[model samples]
Target: QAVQHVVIGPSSLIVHFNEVIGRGHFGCVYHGTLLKIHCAVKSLTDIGEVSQFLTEGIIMKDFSHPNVLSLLGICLRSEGSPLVVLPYMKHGDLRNFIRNETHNPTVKDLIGFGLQVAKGMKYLASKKFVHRDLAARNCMLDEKFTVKVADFGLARDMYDKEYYSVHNKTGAKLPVKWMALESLQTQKFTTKSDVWSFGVLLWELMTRGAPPYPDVNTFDITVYLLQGRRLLQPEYCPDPLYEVMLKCWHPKAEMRPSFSELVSRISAIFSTF
Candidate 1:
C-alpha cells in the first residue's frame, strides 16, 4: 500500500529552482522549504519514470534510523516529475566535509564518524537491504556533525570522474574503486559487498577523503584485487584499526566481517581514544 501521509500537495512546496544544492544520476536536488521547514527537493528530472522515483521514496519511508536518511515527504502532484523532500544537510557530504580543512577533524573525530557509518550499515544489513553505493560521498553530515547515509543506488554525477562504465557495453556506471571483487565481476550486490565498500569508506576517513586506488586505472581495479593487492594503511592509522580494515577486504565474501562485527570492532577502538 502506498503511504498517504507522505504525499504533499505541490502548493505546500516552495522550491528555488535556481538554487541546486546537489546533483545525482536521478536528478538535481534544489533548495526548498516545505511547511516552512528547510528541506531538499529532489526533482526526478533525469529519471523520466515516475514509478521508479516512487519506489525509491517508498523504500526510504520504511527505514527508521538516526544514521540513515528518512523520507520527509513526496510531492507527486507537481509541475514536473515527483519531488522527494529530505532534511537539508548543512555540513553537506562527508567527502567534502573531510577535505574542507576548516573542520580539521582529529583522529578521534574520524573514528566517531566511522563508528556512525558502521552502526547505520548494521541497521541496514539487518533490514536485508543492499546499498549498492556506499562511500563517503554518499554520506551527509548535519550541523551537529552527525553522519547520515544518503543516496541509495543512485550515483552522483558530481563525482563523474570516480565512476567508470563497464566495458562501454551496458552504459551503466559503477564505482569501481569502492566495489568488491564479486561485484566487479558478476555485477552482484549483497550485504557482504556493502561490507567491502564500508572498508573503503573507512579508508576515505583515514585519508581525509583521498580517492582510493589512486595509482590504478578504473579498468585495472579488478585485476589489481585479483593479484592479492589491497589498499595500504593510511598515515596515522593505528595497527589495530588497519587490521579491522583488512578484515573487511578479505578475498572471500563470507570471510568478511558483518556490519554488527564492524560496529563492535570500531566501538572497541573508539573507546581506547
Candidate 2:
C-alpha cells in the first residue's frame, strides 16, 4: 500500500532559532517556532544524514500519544537542512534534569517520573514497537516534570564514550550498555530489550545521571552482562523500586517484566508515598 506523507513548502517554515537545545548524531535541536506555535527543530547538521531524517520523520508522523514526543510537522527546504518540528520541551531532556535535580526530588517524585515513561513504553509495546534506543537522555520533560519518552527509532546522536559500540559487521554505532543480554548477543531488538534499557534509565533517575556499570567498558558491556552483574541499587533508590529495576534486567526476554507490569509496579510504589 502507498503511504501519504505531508510535504511542506520550504518557504512556509520560518526558523528563528534562538539557541541550540541539544545535539545528536543525526542533528542539532534548535529552539524555534512554527506558525506561532513554539517548537524545537531538529535540523540535520550532517549532509550525509538527510536520508535518516526522512525515514525517522515517516515513523514519527504517525505516532500519537500523550507521553510520547509529538511531531508537529516537517520543513523541506531546498537550500538549507531539513527540519523536524517537535514540541518545545521547556524542561529539556532528562539527562540534564537528573544531573541537576537528582538530589532535589522526593522518592515519590522519582517513581512518578519512571511511571510516566513506563506508561509511554506500555503504549508503544502495545503497538509492538521496540524503542531500540531507550535511555534517560532520550526521555524529555515538560514544565510539570512529566517524563515523555523520545527518540523512538532515531539513532542516538549524543552518547557518552562508555555506552556506545561499533557493530563488527555493519560498523554502525550501537548502544551496548542499554541493551539486554540477549539483544547484545544476538543483535535483536525487542520490547524486552527496551525494558532492560528502562531499568538503566531508572538507575539514572535514582543516581542523578551516573553512568551505569561505570567501570565496565562499552565494547565489553555485553561480556559484563553475560557475567551476570547487574546495576547495583542507587543511594536514594527505595527497596521496591530497586527490585523492579532488577526485574527488568532478567537475562531471558520472557523473564523480563512487560511495560504494563512496570507501570503498575512503579505506580504502586509511588502510591505508597
Candidate 3:
C-alpha cells in the first residue's frame, strides 16, 4: 500500500534525540520509534539548497526490495523542511562492522558477505531500479548478515524500459575507484555501470571494507584515475575475489557476468567451503 502524506513530525524531531547513530556536520541520523516501530530519522543536509535530497525522498518512495533499505515513512511538513524515515537497522551499517571487527575474520565470511551483496544488486536490477552509488558505506547489514543496500540519495528512476543508459547526476564526480571507466567522463551510464560499482563493492568486501582511497579525498582520486591509474588492491584481497571484481569492471559491459551466473558461483562457494 502507498504511504500516506510523506511529511514527518517537525524540527523538534531533530533536537530532542537520544542515540546518535550517525551524524555529518550538516545532518544527523537518529534511531528512534515512530508509532511503535523502529525507524531512522536523517535530517536533511543543511546545504543552501535542501531540496536536492528531496529528490532522494521521491526515489525511496518508489523503491522497494528485501535487499535495499526500505523507506518506512517521512516527515515533510515542517515549513517545507525535510526529514527522512527509514527502516532502523539494529546492527548498523556494514562499514562500521568492518572497522569494529575484533579478529579480522576469514575469507569465508568475506565470500558470504560479497555474495549477499551481489544477490542484493541482482534484486535491485530485477526491480527495474538502478542504485548509482553502491558502496560499503552505502550497504547495511542486519544481525543475520542480511545485506540491505542503503543510501538512496544518488538513486536513479529508470522508467523507460528501452533506454539502456543513464546520465550521472549533475554535481561533483563520484568516487572514481568505485566507478567504471565511462563513469569517469561520459555521463552515459547503464545497469552495466551498476555492475561496475558492484565490483568495487566486492573489492571492499575482500579488503575487509577499506575504501579505495583512505588517504585522498574525492578530487585527488579523480585526478589519479584520469591519468590512467587504478587502485592498488590490498594484500588481504584474494585472487578469486579480484577475478570477480575484474569481470564486473569489464571494458565491454556485455562481457560482465550475468546476475544468474554470479548466483551459481556464490552458491557453490557456500556449499563447498
The most accurate candidate by lDDT is 1
Indicate the worst ten consecutive residues by lDDT in candidate 3. Answer: 155-164
lDDT per model vs. reference: 0.84, 0.79, 0.65
Clashes of 2: 2
Candidate 2, residues 1-273: lDDT per residue as tens digits?
A: 112354455455566566777667777778776666778777765655755666666776787887888777777677877777777888877877767844477667777888899999999999888888888888889887777888755333654434667888977778788888888778889998999999999998888788877687777787778788888898889998989999999888899999999988888888886
Quick one: ranking by lDDT, best first?
A: 1, 2, 3
Q: Which one is best on TM-score? A: 1
Tell me the tens digit of each residue's lDDT in model 1 across 1-273.
576666777488898999887766667889999887889888764445766766666666788898987678888754567777888989998989999978899989998999999988999999998888899998899889999987763222444444555557666778889999999988899999999999999999999999898799999999999999999999978789899999989999999999999899899999997
Clashes of each: 0, 2, 5
Ranking by TM-score: 1, 2, 3
Q: What tens-digit string does per-residue lDDT give for candidate 3 at 103-218?
A: 46577887777787777778777876667777777788776777888765522222212212223467443556567677666756667888888877777776776767667565
lDDT of 1: 0.84
TM-score of each: 0.93, 0.88, 0.75
Clashing pairs in 2: 24-157, 25-157
lDDT of 3: 0.65
Q: Candidate 2: misplaced stretches above 4 Å?
A: 1-5, 8-12, 45-58, 101-103, 153-156, 159-162
